[PDB]
Design a protein around this ligand. Structure first.
Ligand SMILES: OC[C@H]1O[C@@](CO)(O[C@H]2O[C@H](CO)[C@@H](O)[C@H](O)[C@H]2O)[C@@H](O)[C@@H]1O
Ligand SMILES: OC[C@H]1O[C@@](CO)(O[C@H]2O[C@H](CO)[C@@H](O)[C@H](O)[C@H]2O)[C@@H](O)[C@@H]1O
Length: 348
């Protein structure tokens, strides 16, 4: 144990990026208004579109009556690039507008361009959400402005932040940009934690709900280590940031992340029956990292248990056949799926 900090907010969570270890949490599954943190998913989808080369940063997109702070009523009052219909804008510029400025018009223009329509784009957002295991998240807009059935949780936001960083790292990299210039005016990132001297913060997204208070998804690094924090429903902007700051600081100070089973490493080699190979490598795959109190590597010990006494073909790469137990001081602290590292087909 290490005593978890008190957190002056509605919900929060602190997650290690490599291990997935939840170091601290309160109300982490309470459904709440995500607001602009919705834009994290918006950007996830745009990032996937770019990575798949379905769109390019240099592409020019035409703005529709859609994306007009005016002839779209819901845009009024909201943060905005000030696009007008007929404008020709860079994907790159819109992408930065979503990310750095949280332009709600940028959101609409890009979604129309990626998916044809807002409804199709929202379909993509909720598609990934299910894929990623965001069991308590449903999106109802491209920008995160007020809608009836729209919620997330601190836990789902962290999982989503983790996927952004992992799956579309070129899209994540834009989130640390302190400003960008559009129409000759510089637009600042409203993530004040980017300016923190006591942390290396490089993301991610701020949000401010109807009544519930102030939100932040943040991620930071320190040596080999990366943490993600979510704070939902802080009462002030200031508390929003310092609670996030103090969670992150606590996690790095007192914990380390280590990787006793590297991806693509063999943990056990086991006999297989009735296959075109007599033996097969088993490992952890990507799941091979654990977050433990500092100083405790010395005392970390890994064990395996197979779920069947004897392994039979056919086997596929990624299949689970047992259990990695991670033990600490001879007490059991984590368990992970023991996976097949190579296909082996039934003999012939
Ligand atoms: O958004 C593209 C737009 O930004 C500028 C600077 O205003 O380019 C910056 O961002 C580019 C990536 O999108 C970088 O390639 C470039 O080095 C950087 O200056 C404009 O040049 C561009 O129109
Ligand atoms: O991390 C807080 C630490 O950094 C300083 C500047 O060195 O404040 C920066 O970060 C704050 C939020 O973390 C911002 O509110 C502030 O505007 C920014 O300069 C110090 O004030 C503080 O000790």
């Amino acid at each position: 144990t290490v005593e978890a900090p008190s957190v002056d907010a509605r919900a929060w969570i602190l997650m290690d990026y490599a291990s997935g270890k939840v170091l601290a949490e309160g109300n982490a599954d309470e459904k709440l208004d995500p607001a602009s943190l919705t834009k994290i998913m918006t950007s996830y989808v745009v990032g996937q579109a770019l990575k798949a080369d379905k769109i390019k940063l240099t592409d020019m997109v035409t703005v529709g009556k859609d994306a007009w702070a005016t002839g779209n009523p819901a845009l009024r009052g909201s943060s905005v690039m000030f696009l007008k219909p007929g404008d020709q804008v860079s994907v790159a510029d819109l992408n930065k507008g979503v990310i750095i400025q949280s332009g709600n018009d940028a959101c609409i223009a890009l979604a129309d361009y990626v998916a044809g329509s807002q409804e199709s784009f929202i379909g993509l957002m909720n598609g990934y959400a299910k894929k990623l295991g965001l069991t308590n998240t449903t999106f109802q807009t491209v920008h995160g402005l007020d809608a009836p059935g729209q919620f997330s949780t601190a836990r789902d936001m962290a999982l989503l932040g983790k996927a952004l960083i992992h799956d579309v790292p070129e899209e994540y990299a834009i989130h640390k940009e302190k400003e960008f210039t559009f129409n000759k005016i510089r637009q600042p990132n409203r993530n004040r934690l980017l300016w923190s001297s006591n942390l290396n913060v490089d993301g991610m997204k701020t949000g401010t709900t109807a009544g519930a208070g102030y939100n932040l998804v943040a991620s930071a690094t320190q040596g080999d280590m990366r943490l993600i924090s979510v704070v939902l429903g802080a009462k002030t902007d200031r508390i929003r940031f310092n609670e996030s700051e103090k969670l992150l600081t606590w996690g790095f100070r007192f914990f380390e992340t280590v990787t006793p089973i590297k991806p693509d490493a063999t943990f056990v080699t086991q006999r297989v029956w009735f296959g075109d190979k007599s033996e097969v490598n088993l490992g952890a795959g990507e799941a091979g990292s654990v977050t433990i109190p500092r100083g405790q590597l010395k005392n970390l010990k890994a064990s395996y248990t197979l779920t069947e006494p004897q392994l039979t073909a056919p086997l596929k790469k990624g299949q689970v056949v047992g259990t990695i137990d991670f033990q600490l001081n001879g007490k059991s602290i984590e368990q992970r799926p023991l996976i097949v590292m190579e296909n082996v087909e039934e003999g012939g």
